[PDB]
Amino acid sequence: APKAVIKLQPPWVSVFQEESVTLHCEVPHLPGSSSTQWFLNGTAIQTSTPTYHITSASEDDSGEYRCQRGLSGRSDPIQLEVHRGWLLLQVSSRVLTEGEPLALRCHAWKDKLVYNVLYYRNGKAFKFFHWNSNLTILKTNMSHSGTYHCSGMGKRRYTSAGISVTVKELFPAPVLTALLEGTPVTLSCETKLLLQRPGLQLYFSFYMGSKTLDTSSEYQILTARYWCEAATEDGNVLKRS
Amino acid sequence: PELLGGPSVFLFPPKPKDTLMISRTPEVTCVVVDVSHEDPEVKFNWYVDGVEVHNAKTKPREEQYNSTYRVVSVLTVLHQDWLNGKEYKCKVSNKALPAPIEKTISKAKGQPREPQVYTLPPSRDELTKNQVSLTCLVKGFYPSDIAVEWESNGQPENNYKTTPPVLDSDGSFFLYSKLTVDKSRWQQGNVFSCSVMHEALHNHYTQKSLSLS
Amino acid sequence: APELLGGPSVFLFPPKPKDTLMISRTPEVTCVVVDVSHEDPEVKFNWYVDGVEVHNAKTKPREEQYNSTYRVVSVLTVLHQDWLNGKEYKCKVSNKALPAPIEKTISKAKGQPREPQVYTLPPSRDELTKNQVSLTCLVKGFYPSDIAVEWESNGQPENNYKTTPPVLDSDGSFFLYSKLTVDKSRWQQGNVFSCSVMHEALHNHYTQKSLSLSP
Ligand SMILES: *[C@@H]1O[C@H](CO[C@@H]2O[C@@H](C)[C@@H](O)[C@@H](O)[C@@H]2O)[C@@H](O[C@@H]2O[C@H](CO)[C@@H](O[C@@H]3O[C@H](CO[C@H]4O[C@H](CO)[C@@H](O)[C@H](O)[C@@H]4O[C@@H]4O[C@H](CO)[C@@H](O[C@@H]5O[C@H](CO)[C@H](O)[C@H](O)[C@H]5O)[C@H](O)[C@H]4NC(C)=O)[C@@H](O)[C@H](O[C@H]4O[C@H](CO)[C@@H](O)[C@H](O)[C@@H]4O[C@@H]4O[C@H](CO)[C@@H](O)[C@H](O)[C@H]4NC(C)=O)[C@@H]3O)[C@H](O)[C@H]2NC(C)=O)[C@H](O)[C@H]1NC(C)=O
Ligand SMILES: *[C@@H]1O[C@H](CO[C@@H]2O[C@@H](C)[C@@H](O)[C@@H](O)[C@@H]2O)[C@@H](O[C@@H]2O[C@H](CO)[C@@H](O[C@@H]3O[C@H](CO[C@H]4O[C@H](CO)[C@@H](O)[C@H](O)[C@@H]4O[C@@H]4O[C@H](CO)[C@@H](O)[C@H](O)[C@H]4NC(C)=O)[C@@H](O)[C@H](O[C@H]4O[C@H](CO)[C@@H](O)[C@H](O)[C@@H]4O[C@@H]4O[C@H](CO)[C@@H](O)[C@H](O)[C@H]4NC(C)=O)[C@@H]3O)[C@H](O)[C@H]2NC(C)=O)[C@H](O)[C@H]1NC(C)=O
Structure with missing residues (x-):
């Protein structure tokens, strides 16, 4: 049976004290009337319903949540942090893979209003909004890794604490590994997986200028009388020679 | 809001x-x-x-x-x-x-008042050191928009500093300008000038010279 | 409203x-x-x-x-x-x-303290035509900018004075000027005026320089 999975509503892994968050333990094979085991830092929690609702978050709710229902595996952990501050940079996850969207929010304490908001990566503001607005980076790459924080104007200028986000690289960029006419031909592309991706596999292509030539991981003439392009099936992690 | x-x-x-x-x-x-x-x-x-x-x-x-x-x-x-x-x-x-x-x-409002420019030689006590301080006192000017420069023999003097304008008792402003020159040049009688540019001055400038007796 | x-x-x-x-x-x-x-x-x-x-x-x-x-x-x-x-x-x-x-x-402001040098400057030749006249106290070479400058004469505080803010000098130290305005009557009668300076790098945190007409 597959692993259990925790879902946050709202999805922000960082919340303010006295804020609300609901944790959903979802097992893909939907079960009927089985109990849910919830764990905070390895310690079981009294709640056994398939969702766990933190009504007024405190520092006692910070840590790693895991869950498990029926014959599923225990979920991968979710890390929740509870903070105080004027502003909080909320993210959906701290770790991601290239091509997975990253959502950011500059959350004001008690849902008050700030304006002229700045989003920072590694100390440098890269986005500005007259009115407070979330920000989503859809086609993420490893350059989006860094420490994110935000600032905005209330009665004064307020600034959030930083929080680091990692976008793991899926595979490096390609080149093509390689005379008398009438020619033996051996040729390959330049990359394979970096994460342990079990059910994923890359699609390669061979282009020159405008004249092109698929999942074919090896290119080869009949016997010989350019670019290798490496992109996932989704076509969201593109790398070229 | x-x-x-x-x-x-x-x-x-x-x-x-x-x-x-x-x-x-x-x-x-x-x-x-x-x-x-x-x-x-x-x-x-x-x-x-x-x-x-x-x-x-x-x-x-x-x-x-x-x-x-x-x-x-x-x-x-x-x-x-x-x-x-x-x-x-x-x-x-x-x-x-x-x-x-x-x-x-x-521009700041109010009747413009002409600055008085006084050059003061270094104090006797400062003569024992390597560099001496020439001072330009500029007082009694309004508005505070002013410019002070030093010059000798047709060339600017690099090493001078001028305080910000300071509001005086009578509503006018004053400042000081300290030009630091080598004691050798001052004792060799070279003449130093302090030029002040202000709107209440005839031709918008005046210049006061200063040298050792 | 939010x-x-x-x-x-x-x-x-x-x-x-x-x-x-x-x-x-x-x-x-x-x-x-x-x-x-x-x-x-x-x-x-x-x-x-x-x-x-x-x-x-x-x-x-x-x-x-x-x-x-x-x-x-x-x-x-x-x-x-x-x-x-x-x-x-x-x-x-x-x-x-x-x-x-x-x-x-x-x-307290960090950085190596430097001793202030104090010099009294008499009125300019050309200022003697006026009947209110300027006595100048130059204080240069001090670090940090925390300083105190006052004026005295005959045991009494002379309060008709103004002092510029500290100014960053080329050598990284600070200087300022204090202008005491006195009536030309008092300057020509031979009265002795004093500039009193207090700074952490001074010995006993205090020094005073006095000023009067040379002859
Ligand atoms: C995003 O960035 C921008 C850009 O900033 C730059 O990039 C960022 C990333 C940073 O790295 C930043 O450090 C960089 O500088 C940010 O834009 C800034 O926004 C702030 C406000 O948030 C502005 O702050 C005001 O600054 C005034 C002084 O500005 C001058 O001085 C600073 C350095 O001190 C310089 O950096 C500026 O560029 C200004 O420099 C002057 O520029 C003039 C024009 O170019 C020059 O004059 C001209 O010179 C040319 C020669 O080139 C010719 O000769 C022309 O003839 C001549 O006209 C001038 O020489 C030059 N001076 C100097 C020294 O270089 C402050 O005066 C102002 O204070 C007032 O307002 C405050 C309210 O915000 C208030 O608190 C103050 O008390 C004051 O209020 C005044 O009070 C008096 C009473 O004393 C009243 O009488 C007045 O009426 C009242 N005024 C007002 C208006 O109410 C501010 O502090 C800042 O200037 C600006 N920088 C730039 C470069 O534009 C932006 O904020 C960032 N965004 C976010 C969201 O963070
Ligand atoms: C509601 O009203 C209150 C009351 O204010 C007063 O009451 C009414 C009648 C009004 O008319 C007001 O105009 C009036 O002032 C408001 O309270 C004020 O709030 C502002 C902030 O919004 C404060 O500004 C700060 O001021 C300090 C310096 O303040 C001294 O000097 C003033 C005169 O120049 C004087 O009025 C002050 O009282 C104070 O005076 C000192 O008082 C103490 C007594 O305890 C005494 O020992 C001192 O000797 C005496 N000094 C003098 C000279 O008299 C200023 O430093 C602050 O600037 C810092 O912060 C800014 C951002 O906030 C930033 O832009 C600056 O760059 C600066 O940042 C500093 O920068 C330096 C480098 O220059 C750096 O080294 C520092 O590390 C760095 N520090 C920081 C923290 O950033 C700031 O401007 C007023 O002082 C304060 N007034 C009073 C009386 O408390 C209130 O704001 C109002 N609310 C609203 C919404 O309007």
Whole structure:
């Protein structure tokens, strides 16, 4: 049976004290009337319903949540942090893979209003909004890794604490590994997986200028009388020679 | 409240030297910051004593390091217009502003008063050291727009510092300027001059010399 | 309406320079908290001299400003040698309109102290035509900018004077000028005027230079 999975509503892994968050333990094979085991830092929690609702978050709710229902595996952990501050940079996850969207929010304490908001990566503001607005980076790459924080104007200028986000690289960029006419031909592309991706596999292509030539991981003439392009099936992690 | 947000506007006076020499070009400068990429177009209207002028020069927007845009408009002003107290207004319009932003700048008001310039030689106690301090006392001037420079034998003196203007008892301003020169040059009788530029001075300047007896 | 995010603000001020150099006086650091709302008026102060908390601070009562806020001030007396050695003074403010206690820390300006040189400059030849005349005290080469300059004559304070702010000099030190205005009557009668300077790099923290007509 597959692993259990925790879902946050709202999805922000960082919340303010006295804020609300609901944790959903979802097992893909939907079960009927089985109990849910919830764990905070390895310690079981009294709640056994398939969702766990933190009504007024405190520092006692910070840590790693895991869950498990029926014959599923225990979920991968979710890390929740509870903070105080004027502003909080909320993210959906701290770790991601290239091509997975990253959502950011500059959350004001008690849902008050700030304006002229700045989003920072590694100390440098890269986005500005007259009115407070979330920000989503859809086609993420490893350059989006860094420490994110935000600032905005209330009665004064307020600034959030930083929080680091990692976008793991899926595979490096390609080149093509390689005379008398009438020619033996051996040729390959330049990359394979970096994460342990079990059910994923890359699609390669061979282009020159405008004249092109698929999942074919090896290119080869009949016997010989350019670019290798490496992109996932989704076509969201593109790398070229 | 409600509509809070959008760009800000700062309006800067011309440099005092630029208003006192007819060959220089005095300018008032209207700077708009916090311009977003989404609403990037900025419109300027300039007024002089309340009627619009159309000769300002507006530079294209420039991306700042904090991801925002900055746009600058420069209005050349007539020397006598600035000295005679005319009011320069910049009106900034942009769709991220629900009502244009207006800023107004002019010369400080009040009857102009002529500065008195006194050069003071180094104190005897300072003569025992490597470098000596020549001092230019400039007092009794209004407004605080002024410029002080040192010179000897037709060349500027590099090593001088001038205090900010200080408000005195009678409502006028004073300052001091300290020129640091090598004791050898001062004892070899080389003559040093302190030049003061101010609007209440005949020809907008006066110059006082100072050298060892 | 959804109110703008924000609450009180805090400012921590250092002792007056004259209080630091005279044991005759008591230097004090001052923690001022402004923009304190009527709805949440309670302010709590915690003082920490170099990490360890102290309790000799006394806080003034809440005083309302006409912009419909409160301004609470807490003053803490400090030791002379502690301030001049480099002790770090931390104010901690707590208020229910704050997400967390605000902390500010003040200390003496770091950097190698330099002794001030004091020179009295008599009036200029051309200023003697006026009947009100300028006596000048130049103080240069001092670090840090914390200094005190006064004028005396015949045991009495001469208060008709003004002193420029400290000015950053080319060699990284500071200088200033003090102008004392006296009637030309007093200058020509031969009275002796004195410029009194106080700075941590002075011996006994004090030096004075006097001035009068040469013949
Ligand atoms: C995003 O970034 C931008 C850009 O900033 C730059 O990039 C970022 C990433 C940072 O790295 C930043 O450090 C960089 O500088 C930010 O834009 C800034 O926004 C702030 C406000 O948030 C502005 O702050 C005001 O600054 C005024 C002084 O500005 C001058 O001085 C600073 C350095 O001190 C310079 O950096 C500026 O560029 C200004 O420099 C002047 O520029 C003039 C025009 O170019 C020059 O005059 C012209 O010179 C030319 C020669 O080149 C010709 O000769 C022309 O003839 C001549 O006209 C001038 O020489 C030059 N001076 C110097 C020294 O270089 C402050 O005056 C102002 O204070 C007023 O307003 C405050 C309210 O915000 C208030 O608290 C103050 O008390 C004061 O209020 C005044 O009070 C007095 C009473 O004393 C009243 O009488 C007045 O009426 C009242 N005025 C007003 C208007 O109410 C501000 O502090 C800052 O200038 C601006 N920088 C730039 C470069 O534009 C932006 O904020 C960032 N966004 C976010 C969200 O963070
Ligand atoms: C509601 O009203 C209150 C009451 O204000 C007063 O009451 C009414 C009648 C009004 O008319 C006000 O105009 C009036 O002032 C408001 O409270 C004020 O709040 C502002 C902040 O919004 C404070 O500004 C700070 O001021 C300090 C310096 O303040 C001294 O000097 C003032 C005169 O120049 C004087 O009025 C002050 O009281 C204070 O005076 C000192 O008082 C102590 C007594 O305890 C005494 O020991 C001192 O000797 C005495 N000094 C003098 C000279 O008299 C200033 O330093 C602050 O600037 C810092 O912060 C800014 C951002 O907040 C920033 O732009 C600056 O650059 C600066 O940042 C500092 O920069 C330096 C480098 O220059 C750096 O080294 C520092 O590390 C760095 N520090 C920080 C923290 O950033 C700031 O401008 C007023 O002082 C305060 N007034 C009073 C009386 O408390 C309130 O704001 C109002 N609310 C609203 C919404 O309007």
